[PDB]
Amino acid sequence: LDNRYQPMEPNPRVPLSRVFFASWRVVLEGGIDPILRGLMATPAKLNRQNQIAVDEIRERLFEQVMRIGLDLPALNMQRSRDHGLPGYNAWRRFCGLPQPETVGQLGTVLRNLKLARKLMEQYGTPNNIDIWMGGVSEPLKRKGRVGPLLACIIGTQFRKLRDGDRFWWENEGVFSMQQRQALAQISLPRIICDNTGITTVSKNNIFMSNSYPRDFVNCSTLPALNLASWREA
Amino acid sequence: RAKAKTRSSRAGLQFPVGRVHRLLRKGNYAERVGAGAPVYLAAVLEYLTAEILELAGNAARDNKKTRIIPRHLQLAVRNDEELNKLLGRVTIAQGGVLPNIQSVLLP
Amino acid sequence: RAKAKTRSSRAGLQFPVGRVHRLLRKGNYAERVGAGAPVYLAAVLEYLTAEILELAGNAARDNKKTRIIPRHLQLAVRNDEELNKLLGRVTIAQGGVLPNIQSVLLPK
Amino acid sequence: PHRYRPGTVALREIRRYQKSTELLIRKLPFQRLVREIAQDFKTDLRFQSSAVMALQEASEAYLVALFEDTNLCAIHAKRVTIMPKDIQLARRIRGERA
Amino acid sequence: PHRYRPGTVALREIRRYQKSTELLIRKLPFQRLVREIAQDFKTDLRFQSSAVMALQEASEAYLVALFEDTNLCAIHAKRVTIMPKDIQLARRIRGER
Amino acid sequence: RDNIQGITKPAIRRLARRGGVKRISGLIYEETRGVLKVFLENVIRDAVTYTEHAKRKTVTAMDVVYALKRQGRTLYGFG
Amino acid sequence: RDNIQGITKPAIRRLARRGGVKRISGLIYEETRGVLKVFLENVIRDAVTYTEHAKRKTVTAMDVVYALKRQGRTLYGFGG
Amino acid sequence: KTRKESYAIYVYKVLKQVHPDTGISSKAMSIMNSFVNDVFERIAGEASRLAHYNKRSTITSREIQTAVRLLLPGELAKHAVSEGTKAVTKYTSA
Amino acid sequence: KTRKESYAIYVYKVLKQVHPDTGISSKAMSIMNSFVNDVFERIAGEASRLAHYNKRSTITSREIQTAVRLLLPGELAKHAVSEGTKAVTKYTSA
DNA sequence: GTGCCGAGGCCGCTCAATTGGTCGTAGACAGCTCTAGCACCGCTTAAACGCACGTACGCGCTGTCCCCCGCGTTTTAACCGCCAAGGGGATTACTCCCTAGTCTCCAGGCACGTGTCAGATATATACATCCGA
DNA sequence: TCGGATGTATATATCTGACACGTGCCTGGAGACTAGGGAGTAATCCCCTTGGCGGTTAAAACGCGGGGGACAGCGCGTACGTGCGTTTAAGCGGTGCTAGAGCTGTCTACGACCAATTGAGCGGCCTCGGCAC
Ligand SMILES: *[C@@H]1O[C@H](CO[C@@H]2O[C@@H](C)[C@@H](O)[C@@H](O)[C@@H]2O)[C@@H](O[C@@H]2O[C@H](CO)[C@@H](O[C@@H]3O[C@H](CO[C@H]4O[C@H](CO)[C@@H](O)[C@H](O)[C@@H]4O)[C@@H](O)[C@H](O[C@H]4O[C@H](CO)[C@@H](O)[C@H](O)[C@@H]4O)[C@@H]3O)[C@H](O)[C@H]2NC(C)=O)[C@H](O)[C@H]1NC(C)=O
Secondary structure (H helix, E strand, O other): OOOOOOOOOOOOOOOOOHHHOHHHHHOOOOOOHHHHHHHHHOOOOOOOEEEEEOOHHHEHHHHHHOOOOOOOOHHHHHHHHHHOOOOOOHHHHHOOOOOOOHHHHHHHHHHOOOHHHHHHHHHHHHHOOHHHHHHHHHHOOOOOOOOOOHHHHHHHHHHHHHOOOOOOOOOOOOOOOOHHHHHOOOHHHHHHHEEEOOOOEEEEOOOOOOOOOOOEEEHHHHOOOOHHHHHHO | OOOOOHHHHHHOOOHHHHHHHHHHHHHOOOOOOHHHHHHHHHHHHHHHHHHHHHHHHHHHHOOOEEOOOOOHHHHHHHOOOOHHHHHEEEEOOOOOOOOOOHHHHHH | OOOOHHHHHHHOOOOOOHHHHHHHOOOOOOOOOOHHHHHHHHHHHHHHHHOOOOOOOHHHHHHOOEEEOOHHHHHHHOOOHHHHHHHOEEEOOOOOOOOOOOOOOOOO | OOOEEEEEHHHHHHHHHHOOOOOOHHHHHHHHHHHHHOOOOOOOEOHHHHHHHHHHHHHHHHHHHHHHHHHHHHHOOOOEEEEEHHHHHEEEEEEOOO | OOOOOOHHHHHHHHHHHHOOOOOOHHHHHHHHHHHHHHHHOOOOOOOHHHHHHHHHHHHHHHHHHHHHHHHHHHOOOOOOEEEEHHHHHHHHOOOOO | OHHHHHOHHHHHHHHHHOOOOOOEOOOOHHHHHHHHHHHHHHHHHHHHHHHHHHHOOOHHHHHHHHHHOOOOOEOOOOO | OOOOHHHHHHHHHHHHOOOOOEEEOOHHHHHHHHHHHHHHHHHHHHHHHHHHHHOOEOOOHHHHHHHHHHOOEEEOOOOO | OOOOOOOOOHOOOOOOOHOOEEEEOOOHHHHHHHHHHHHHHHHHHHHHHHHHOOOEEEEEEHHHHHHHHHHHHOOHHHHHHHHHHHHHHHHOOO | OOOOOOOOHHHHHHHHHOOOEEEEEEHHHHHHHHHHHHHHHHHHHHHHHHHHHHHOOEOOOOHHHHHHHHHHHOOHHHHHHHHHHHHHHHHOOO
């Protein structure tokens, strides 16, 4: 997108199979400002039980730099098998969730009976369902984008990464109280305003605002990071 | 005129913004009530209701039950530290008590 | 016109009926406030104040002092069952505590 | 002549009644007690069934919480038997009889 | 070499401190503690003298009531010495735990 | 009118079992009856006051709920 | 910044004596310090919230009174 | 400065009526003012809740009487009700 | 027959949002309605007291946010504040 | 496996929420001001701190026996299914009296100024009380 | 069971500062009206509360046997109160600076208020499957 958040000619919409390992687009095609604008002002893709992954990554992944296109979900499940990860039921048991055994129980858990029939036909038992497939086939949590199993795993991992980190910014002795309060005023919109030539930037929760110009403000209204607390005397 | 649009739909909620506004206006709380107060109150009420309902549904599922009864509500409230702190002096009818036996009384 | 008379004077009260009425009207309590509510409230407040002050003055006289200090108020409050029940969750500044010692802790 | 230990059936009852939500007091005697108590405040009084039910629920919850506190007090004194002094101490510390 | 039996001076101090109304905690250390606690909530926070005094009075009254309940708990267990378990039991029964 | 005895010893024992009590002394029942009588007296007095203020001869569930809420014992399930 | 030690053992002993305590264990002082810190944290947090809502930088006695009343600890003689 | 009103002079008149010789200090006056304000707030809030429960938009003497009966315990409620009824009758007589 | 309003439709809508298959009972609806009313009353009263303390005649979003921070404990207050801020921003945009 | 009663779904309709304009006042903002909170500084000195002793007390072990728990039997009344009368809760219409609202004004209450007398602070004394002898 | 010895209440001087009185002023409470709607008072409808009856059987009361736990000694170590000597910031009093709480003057935009419109939700009525048995 250009300065007015309109499609940028030429090539406003480029297929993903033509952008993999293409740094010449970053170099010779206007830099990173249009790319950041497109990231900020374009809706993402919703995860639906009948619309999981697009064909760009499923049929034509790394097509230009390889002898044949790859299959990203197939690679995910083959990697899960390569890593020797347990099945869907084992991880449901791990997170304290009920483990379905029949097609009816799997349909009740997934809230999609036809998907349960498809999974039963492909695998034969819920215990053999790969972790990625079962995680992305579960209905999404309210105000969330992962199923209960994926939410459990991700929350546990990030809680461990936060509490187990000695140099956590909120940990005492890492940052001073004034420095912590100054850091509390940061925002990715402010970073984009400071480090690029973009003057109109989405509002708070940059990961939610996607429609121009309803949720876009001027770059000057964003509070800046006050580094005066870092002065040593 | 233009087609009517509920304020809850504009705010993206499911709790009634208009009813909350009317209750605030007729509840003898202040001389005037702002236009953003009902939206905030409805959002907070919806969030709390969703939290407790989700916990109660999880408790009901743990008991192999299809419906939510007051026992599941009590189990959801008393097993959550923050909800228990909020509903500390509150008695839920037909809720029972949390199963807990002191260690010294065990054989 | 006529010689203005305070509403407290008509009711034989030393507490302000007009001020209580104004506080009731501007206190966001109800849409309308009746004419007899301020008189009743002022009378109740005056009675409670008179009783607590009588007990505090009795305590001060028992302490051979003239002026009333918070210690006398605390003694008066805690030595009356009804007032203690009314002020159970109230902390009086510079009031101390009622002198008591458990019988087992006594030397014997 | 299979006789259980003097503590097995008590623990069984504890596990049984901590998993249910019923009312442990018979409804008719409690209703009669409520009416007898209310006779001291206003003669010729009528009661809704929901009012008596709410009173029973509140009383049962209050008694259960008081008994939990009393059990804590008894355990504090290195005992397993619930005694009236434990109830009195719990009521004092709670602020009821204080 | 005169010497008082253990317990007499304790009762004397009880009778002395149950008669006076003065604050039993030093003012400056309590002010420093209050400022240190309030630092976690705001920067460059200023305190009125009356605010610190009110905080001290409330804290002292709360601690005195807690110690009364603790003494009751210790006496219940056929003891005259208060222990942390008595404080924990009192705070549980009060509902502060 | 001796209805405080209607709360029988097995009922008090059941209420204690729900509270996790393993052993009960023989003198606990009278104390529990007295405590229950005091609590019911307070709640019923408040409810009857609420009923008289409403100019009614019938005690409703709302009166009991308000009486309990006035004592910091909010009850959910009756309005 | 270790100001919790400013509440010395003699001060806690005096507070216990005012409460009618004859004998005090050696581990009581740490428990008392922790309880005091928790109580002060709650009250001061409420007071700071009240002050911040008023767009003020000075914590007044009335904010402390409102906080204590919120916890159910109405205090007489300070403010009104 | 600005006028900050309080129940100080009225409390002094009541004290002089009760004890014609004793005085009062500033801290005791502050405590009495806080007590009066607290009791006023309690009774007014109870009366407001009573009026809201009965779907009435007016606080009358009956609401204040019921609030006093609910809050004040034992003989305090009876004596306060008697004093308030006497004051209301005297006010409405003149 | 008079019309009695309650938060039953909205609670059912939220339940279907969370648990589409799980149903609810009548007593659970009564408890939900009582809980919603109690929380509403608590927040509204705290906001009213905040407005009265600062000598304001208007209850705004700031008063509600501060009341939520004061009453709701721990992370509940933060999450509720975030949800309310998002709702207010969305309403202001639309 | 049964079935049945309570949760779920569907249709009037009506009142409460929405939409479109105005008014005036509550709140936002800029500016001054002058309390009052904060930051050194020295001197007492009262209180905190460190320490040794011994003695009273907390804690563990042991034995009694009595009080409480478990179980069988009989009695009691709780519980449940109908039936009837009716007191009283709940709703509706009229109107009238009680309360909100407004202009005038004047006196009660608040801010300021002050002085003297209850009250805080030594001081020597007389007891009050406690601990071997 | 009495002498010393430690601590405390008491009556007596001696400053002292704050509480009560006096005065000026101002703003809000009272006097005298007008307008409108909240509710007080009848009247009516039906519903849910109370009283009654009888049959089942679940539960409470009573009694008996036994074991285990509450309570009273008894001992033993230990740790906490008491007193003394050393140290340390607490407190008091003055001094200086300026941050911000508070009051004043402008102004505008936002919520209360009013009128017209319509559809959201509440009550009534089926209908079937989740759960008590
Ligand atoms: C068969 O045993 C399974 C395993 O049993 C384990 O070993 C035996 C001998 C016992 O000791 C048993 O207690 C052990 O669990 C058992 O499945 C187990 O079920 C539990 C309870 O659902 C699972 O625990 C839950 O795990 C997750 C993740 O937390 C864990 O992992 C992370 C990372 O390692 C750690 O940081 C955590 O501390 C835990 O170790 C959570 O979902 C959950 O905690 C959250 O949820 C509960 C309630 O939902 C809340 O109370 C908590 O506060 C948290 O919010 C639990 O901790 C356990 O993972 C699982 N084990 C395995 C190996 O899958 C199974 O039930 C047994 N089968 C039968 C039929 O009984």
